[PDB]
Write a protein that binds this ligand. Structure first.
Ligand SMILES: O=c1[nH]c(=O)n([C@@H]2O[C@H](CO)[C@@H](O)[C@H](O)[C@H]2O)cc1C(F)(F)F
Ligand SMILES: O=c1[nH]c(=O)n([C@@H]2O[C@H](CO)[C@@H](O)[C@H](O)[C@H]2O)cc1C(F)(F)F
Lengths: 810, 810
């Protein structure tokens, strides 16, 4: 049907169908009469997975013959989403399978909706990992993603009476056709025990053994026949485990709990034992796999020339003392040499500056669970602190501030400090975030070793985030400039010579109308709710957090509703406001925010006076495959965190790429986005980082805003008096309370300039053709934000490998 | 190579190899250079499983078009063992795959040893189920095996210091290529709650829901293209289960425990909740599957014409009140009609008369767990007892003896009584066992309904138990009489006209020497132990139990050792004594017996005076695939239970079929075996049932035997004084104690006649040619004991279906 989806050759289509019928018969053991759409998805899924394997085997062999430096990306999160379309895309099979399946009298898109998301992450940080792996394959790097194969991913979100209900994400119920279990590479992981000293150094003994079993999942690069591997460990009990007989067997579950469930907090540290075990588990099993692969090529001098370990935040920071452990205790290298190797091997990426999000482990946990690693940590601290003292003599304060060990009621290990000491590079995730690191929380570490600190502004993959979710737009782009930009997104810049082209203007706007028409019909079919598609689609999708300021959005929405009710026969530009995302189960405030958003919808959506000029929809169960739908259909993207709090953001980049305009604050990657499009093509408002600093010095008093702004006073009065919750008038007392006395995020201080900016947004929307020319200016400048650029920067400036766009043979 | 293993056509062999290479590449994602023998087993396993599926699909369809009466075999045990060779055998692919694999430079037998046993049973009762399913397929019955898919089967046995150690049988670790998960037929099962009465009858409410997910495994018939299904349920938690978030998810394990592990007692009832849940689970999920299949053909009159449910002992006896429940509470039939349907549908097979082995559930368990079924049970009891009273008025004793409800300190439900009341046929498992039922424990029930009581003497499958484990003997049999006897074992009788044939005599004896030579080399390779293959192979293999009288065997072995040490230069016929089997983890006495057997070996096997005239080997980890090896290599089969205790036995039949002679008591099926071969061709000794009865009346006093038999006195003195346990002289005080004061099984009373009989055994062994002519007389008469005969009897006399030996089309 469409160009970018590749060739549908007679030979390819006839071969596809015969393999589909082979899988339905031999693999699924069904025939046409009994099969359900789920059997059809699986037959297609196995048929597509057949095209991977040859390439998968040839890529693993290529890397053995050629022996290049290997990248190991340790993450506790890989938010993969669905695999079938992405696989077809990267193999150029999309139009072929479509044809083949239409010929068997099936609808391929309806099959695609049966695939479960692999939701092995919470949001941005897990999804960065997924985009990264795609980019690493497309750029021919010899790279491995390592993590944990959780039995249960991010919970599925239900709304009941406007409240969030969490049910378990049993994503493996029907089988995962993409993974290959590999029990032959099972590896022991140790916990507890104690430390013995001998003539021959330290020995860690009397440990409990948990087995780690790997499952490998293919990661195809974009049309270059590279297929890399993501390896996820699963926890297994040993067979003499505890070995009532019955109870002994039942208690095998205790050990296999380690990989059962993904912890559901975004940007919040919870210091639970189970979590620390999961972190140790992935680090221990992965390092032995790494060392084993290094050995099959005695000499660890070349270890850093052959291995790179990237730590995705502090979650796998125990890699550092674990590598020392293996090197010092098991390979018998002396400390100083081991340390040299570790530092040159490891690098660390920070993803936040929020104090509550930093991992800080109780010493009493590590001591029980990992007593040797505690010994190694102390040893690292001592030697570190002697360097600090040598360079800044007499500065006792700096010494306590830099210690990996925090003192106080309960001793903690600051894990961020650990990573800086033991890594050769440390990077933030957008330019303003990297500066903040150097100016504030890592200032002391920067003065000691200025050379470690870098920046690597995030990116997203244009394969999923354009070609896959938006074939309409990809295609009209391709008609004018060719296919090449799919792996070279800078080329989008050539779109700038089409900004005054009448035919392109109409095509950009038509794709956007089509995506809206389709999403509005998804909203009726799957969720029985009725929206006007001629409105401006104003969407905020992302995890629910106070710093993300969903409440600021709520305040805008109430304001519009109030202005409509004040002058009902005045013309307003109609909007559909959509707000979505999960709240972590224990994050009370977050869950109250969700309740507020639906409460506003219960009032606004049923006012006859409002008409369909204003609708508030809470988008239920937000996740990767819902992002693929809503993001293409958006006109306005809301990126309205308080300046200084959102490390980078990546949703911001998804929308820019897909024809939405951005209302946002000067935060994280928003800053470079505006810089790239020019500030005129962006809706920027509110405090800059320095303005927030000015406000903290004299102090934030919210009462002042309540006092000087009647429109805002009225909203608070409405919240308080039970206007949005008539049956429980004091349901929102917590929110009003926080807003008034304890708002760490200065919601009111930005309210006035936000509403004003919102007016300017409505004004451009009134003029379709200028709206669209500005859209073109955004899309045309979105190239910087490709994860291809990001990974090429990691490769040259951190890992020491040259990327390569050359195809491997078929 | 050999005839019975079928054709190896050029076309079949070339097709086999290409599919082997396809599976290794696409399914296993390996290539020749990296593959290990386990990858090779799997590629062959998938290649063979490919030949099943077409037939599997065609058989399920045939049964839908033709709509015959369906047999449902409910068992808590299916002791399947390995699947690959059996599958090849029944498909006639054996020589072909052998050729194909030899051509790829592999050894097929070495691949076969990598398959794990499916040890989803404890011994005879689970293995009867397996033989039955094979026979049901071969005889074209539309039959389904239903049970539980345990994650952990019978534990693997290790010996450490001569003691049994149990480790968990993680049989699913590497995948099971034979099963197909079918999550689309998942079904809810209810537990707990309470009972509400309405206008509209009883309602069972506030229950906990456990999901039951089926896995289907193909059961191929012998060369007739029938492939039936064994469906095993697996326990799954629902997704709103309990829905800390973390802990809620972790606690999903509680519900999935139901199918985690197989209970490891043979012939012993343990009244644990977990076990009763497993029993309810398989019954509930299976009945709904049955009813659903009946509906896809309102009217339950024809239910018994279309459904048969066979209850393999009392384990699935809740089928009875569950069927009433569904019929009465859910389908709204009146009681009397529901009851008529149930009785005509259900039939019950008893497998023991040992009081400690009968299931007798505490009323306080059923009341909490299954409160409605308790109501139904009481209702069944009342109506039952009114029939008894009507037929035997004034007999108050009979009333208390027959009650399904036993009174006393804790109320119990006698489950055997339940099955008799609600079944139309009740059968024992050999002729003497069925009489004992009628004369003793079910005497009252027989007087009430003489018409229910039948006999169905057990059998074994000649496919596994001859063709598969013994191709040497199958082949020489085939050379003289043809292949036909494989599905018609009566034909073996034609062997009787070859008893004086010199060429057949030498061939029978040569196969036996070959099997011995091969087993002796298995004993060195896999277990570093050194046996003389010219000895008589004297083997007792079966679960360890007091009633099986392994101790009687120990007493014989010590006697021989003592007679050798008394006259060392006297000639004895050399023996290798092999004794094997597992003891249930909590069965103390059993575990002590194992310790005794190895202790005797520690003394006997290292005496230089003994030479290699006597060796005692404990055969470690006895299980289905070890039976396939040792049984063909046996000269003497030990079947020496006290008369009246072994319901039937099936090992007895395996050995008879494979050229061993039998030393045994007149117990269970031994009685019909001797009757079929003639008593002269059998070594029969010891008390008959009536002799044991005579002894119970005057009372068993073991001291008398100790007093009158010096050879026995000496053995007890040796046991007591620490001769077999020098470091712990009183290690065997328990056994000596039991033997002397509390032997429920009258070991000493049989000792004298056992040793005498053992002498007559050694005497025939001295004359090879007469030994062998008697072997021929046994094998030639072993036909009655084919499970083909047994199942044909169930079919005609219980299920009301005509068997059929006609092939289905390819
Ligand atoms: O727990 C988290 N969850 C996230 O989504 N991020 C996100 O990580 C993304 C990846 O760089 C950034 O774009 C976002 O600004 C950032 O908030 C970070 C953390 C942590 F606190 F840094 F660990
Ligand atoms: O728990 C058991 N385990 C067994 O192996 N059998 C055996 O079941 C076999 C099947 O008929 C018979 O040949 C044996 O004589 C009998 O002991 C019986 C029971 C039970 F007690 F009847 F339930």
């Amino acid at each position: 049907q469409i160009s970018v989806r590749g060739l549908a050759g007679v030979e390819n289509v006839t071969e596809l169908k015969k393999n589909f019928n082979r899988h339905l018969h031999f693999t699924l053991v069904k025939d046409r009469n009994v099969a359900t759409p789920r059997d059809y998805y699986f037959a297609l899924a196995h048929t597509v997975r057949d095209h991977l394997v040859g390439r998968w085997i040839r890529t693993q062999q290529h890397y053995y013959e050629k022996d290049p430096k290997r990248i190991y990306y340790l993450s506790l999160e890989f938010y993969m989403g669905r695999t079938l379309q992405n696989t077809m895309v990267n193999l150029a099979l999309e139009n072929a399978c479509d044809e083949a399946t239409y010929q068997l009298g099936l609808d391929m898109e309806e099959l695609e909706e049966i695939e479960e998301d692999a939701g092995l992450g919470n949001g941005g940080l897990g999804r960065l990992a997924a985009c990264f792996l795609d980019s690493m394959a497309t750029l021919g790097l010899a790279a491995y993603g390592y993590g944990i194969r959780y039995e249960f991913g991010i919970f599925n979100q239900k709304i009941c009476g406007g409240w969030q209900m969490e049910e378990a994400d049993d994503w493996l119920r029907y089988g995962n056709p993409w993974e290959k279990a590999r029990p032959e590479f099972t590896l022991p992981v140790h916990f507890y025990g104690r430390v013995e000293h001998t003539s021959q150094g330290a020995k860690w003994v009397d440990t409990q053994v948990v087995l780690a079993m790997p499952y490998d999942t293919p990661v195809p690069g974009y049309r270059n026949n590279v297929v890399n591997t993501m390896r996820l460990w699963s926890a297994k009990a040993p067979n003499d485990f505890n070995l009532g007989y019955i109870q002994a067997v039942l208690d095998r579950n205790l050990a296999e709990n380690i990989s059962r469930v993904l912890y559901p907090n975004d940007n919040f540290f919870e210091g639970k034992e189970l979590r620390l075990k999961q972190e140790y588990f992935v680090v221990a099993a992965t390092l032995q796999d790494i060392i084993r692969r290094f050995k099959s090529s005695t000499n660890f001098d070349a270890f850093p020339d052959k291995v790179a370990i990237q730590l995705n935040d502090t979650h796998p920071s125990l890699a550092i003392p674990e590598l020392m452990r293996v090197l010092v205790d098991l390979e018998r290298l002396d400390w100083d040499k081991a340390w040299e190797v570790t530092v040159k091997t490891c690098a660390y990426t920070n993803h936040t500056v929020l104090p509550e999000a930093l991992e800080r482990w109780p010493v009493h946990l590590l001591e029980t669970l990992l007593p040797r690693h505690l010994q190694i940590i102390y040893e690292i601290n001592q030697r570190f602190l002697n360097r600090v003292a040598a360079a800044f003599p007499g500065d006792v304060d700096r010494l306590r501030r830099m210690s990996l060990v925090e003192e106080g009621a309960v001793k903690r290990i600051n894990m961020a400090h650990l990573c800086i000491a033991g890594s050769h590079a440390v990077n933030g995730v957008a330019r303003i975030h990297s500066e903040i690191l150097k100016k504030t929380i890592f200032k002391d570490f920067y003065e000691l070793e200025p050379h470690k600190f870098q920046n690597k502004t995030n990116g997203i993959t244009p394969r999923r985030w354009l070609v896959l979710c938006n074939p309409g737009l990809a295609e009209i782009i391709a008609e004018r400039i060719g296919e090449e930009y799919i792996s070279d997104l800078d080329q989008l810049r050539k779109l700038l010579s089409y900004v005054d082209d009448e035919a392109f203007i109409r095509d950009v706007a038509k794709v956007k109308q089509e995506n809206k028409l389709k999403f509005a019909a998804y909203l009726e079919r799957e969720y029985k709710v009725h929206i006007n598609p001629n409105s401006l689609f104003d969407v905020q999708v992302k995890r629910i957090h106070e710093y993300k300021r969903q409440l600021l959005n709520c305040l805008h929405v109430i304001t519009l509703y109030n202005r409509i009710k004040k002058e009902p026969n005045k013309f307003v530009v109609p909007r559909t406001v959509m707000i979505g995302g999960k709240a972590a189960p224990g994050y009370h405030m977050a869950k109250m925010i969700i309740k507020l958003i639906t409460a506003i919808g219960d009032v606004v959506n049923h006012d006859p006076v409002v008409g369909d000029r204003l609708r508030v929809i809470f988008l239920e169960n937000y996740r990767v495959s819902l992002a693929e739908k809503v993001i293409p259909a958006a006109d306005l993207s809301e990126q309205i965190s308080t300046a200084g709090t959102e490390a980078s953001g990546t949703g911001n980049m998804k929308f820019m790429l897909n024809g939405a305009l951005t209302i946002g604050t000067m935060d994280g990657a928003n800053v470079e986005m505006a810089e790239e499009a020019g500030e005129e093509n962006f809706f920027i408002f509110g405090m800059r980082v320095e303005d927030v600093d000015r406000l903290d010095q004299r102090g934030y008093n919210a009462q002042e805003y309540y006092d000087r702004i009647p429109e805002l006073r009225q909203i608070i009065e409405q919240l308080s008096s039970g206007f949005f919750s008539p049956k429980q008038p004091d349901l929102f007392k917590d929110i009003v309370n926080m807003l008034m006395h304890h708002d760490r995020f200065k919601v009111f201080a930005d309210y006035e300039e936000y509403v004003k900016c919102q007016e300017r947004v409505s004004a451009l929307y009134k003029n379709p053709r200028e709206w669209t020319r500005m859209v073109i200016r955004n899309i045309a400048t979105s190239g910087k934000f490709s994860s291809d650029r990001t990974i090429a920067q990691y490769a040259r400036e951190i890992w020491g490998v040259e990327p390569s766009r050359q195809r491997l043979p078929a």
